[PDB]
Write a protein that binds this ligand. Structure first.
Ligand SMILES: O=P(O)(O)OC[C@H]1O[C@@H](n2cnc3c(NCc4ccco4)ncnc32)[C@H](O)[C@@H]1O
Ligand SMILES: O=P(O)(O)OC[C@H]1O[C@@H](n2cnc3c(NCc4ccco4)ncnc32)[C@H](O)[C@@H]1O
Lengths: 126, 131
C-alpha cells in the first residue's frame, strides 16, 4: 500500500509535531510517499499512484486543499483528520466533500490520533 | 459568461473588502456564481451547490493570498474539470504562496498573477481583455 500524506507547510507549521505522529503511524499501514513547477509535478505523480490519501486539515492551507481536490477527481479514497480543539471551524468544501468510503472527515482529539488511524485502516478502508 | 470566484471564508476573512472589489469588477465580464465570498450538517449542501457552479463556470478566478482549504480544493477540482484559471496573489502581505498553487501554472490554462493592492481591478481588466 502507498499512502499520500497532506499537511500545511506555507499555511503554517503549528501542528507539525502532529504531522510527524500521523506519518509515523501511516508507516504501519503503507509506504508514505511525502522549482515550484517540479514540486507540483513530483507530488501529482505521487498522488496519481497513491492507494490512499490522508490529510490533516486543521491548519488551513492551499496546498492541502489543492491535493484533496486533485485526489477526489482521481477517485482516490481520502481520510481527513480535523482537530475541533483548535477552536477552528472546518472548511465547508472539505467537510461537505464527505461521501461514503470515498471521502471521510473524522474529528479527533490529539491524544487519540494513532488509535483513530488504526481504526480507519482496520475497518474503514475498502 | 459564468465566473466562479474563490476567496477565503473559514480560512480567514481579512481580505473581505478586497473580495468585494474583485467580485464587483468580475461582474463586468460574466455572472459571478459565488457571490457569498464578498459578503453544522449543512456543509454537504454547500459542497454540492458549489461543485455544480464549478462544472457550469466558464472561468475560475481565485485570490490566493489568504491560505484556505476551500480555495485550494476549488482550484484542484477546476484543474480536473479542465477550467481556465486565474490566481491573484499579493506579495505585499509577506506570505509565500503555496508551491502547489504557483507550481500548477500552465501556459494560459492556469495562471498566477502577482499584484499590488490598489491595482486588483486593473489586473482583472488586463486578463479578460486578453483571454
Ligand atoms: O501549505 P502549502 O500550502 O505550503 O501546503 C503544503 C502541502 O502541499 C505539499 N507541498 C508544498 N510545498 C512542498 C514542497 N516544497 C518545499 C517547501 C518549502 C517551503 C514550502 O514548501 N515539497 C514537497 N511538498 C510540498 C505537501 O504535500 C503539503 O501537503
Ligand atoms: O476558506 P473557506 O475554506 O471556508 O473555503 C472557501 C470556499 O468555500 C466556498 N463556500 C463556503 N461557504 C459557502 C457558501 N455558503 C453560503 C451557503 C449556505 C448554503 C448555501 O450557500 N456559499 C458559497 N460558497 C461557499 C467559497 O467558494 C470559498 O471560495
Amino acid at each position: 500500500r502507498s499512502v499520500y500524506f497532506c499537511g500545511s507547510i506555507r499555511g503554517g507549521r503549528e501542528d507539525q509535531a502532529l504531522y510527524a505522529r500521523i506519518v509515523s503511524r501511516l508507516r504501519r499501514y503503507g509506504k508514505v510517499l511525502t522549482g515550484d513547477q517540479f514540486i507540483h509535478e513530483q507530488n501529482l505523480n505521487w498522488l496519481q499512484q497513491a492507494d490512499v490519501v490522508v490529510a490533516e486539515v486543521t491548519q488551513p492551507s492551499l496546498g492541502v486543499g489543492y491535493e484533496l481536490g486533485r485526489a477526489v477527481a482521481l477517485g482516490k479514497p481520502i481520510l481527513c483528520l480535523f482537530r475541533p480543539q483548535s477552536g477552528r471551524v472546518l472548511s465547508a468544501m472539505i467537510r461537505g466533500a464527505a461521501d461514503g468510503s470515498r471521502f471521510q472527515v473524522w474529528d479527533y482529539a490529539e491524544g487519540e490520533v494513532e488509535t483513530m488511524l488504526d481504526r480507519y485502516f482496520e475497518a474503514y478502508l475498502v
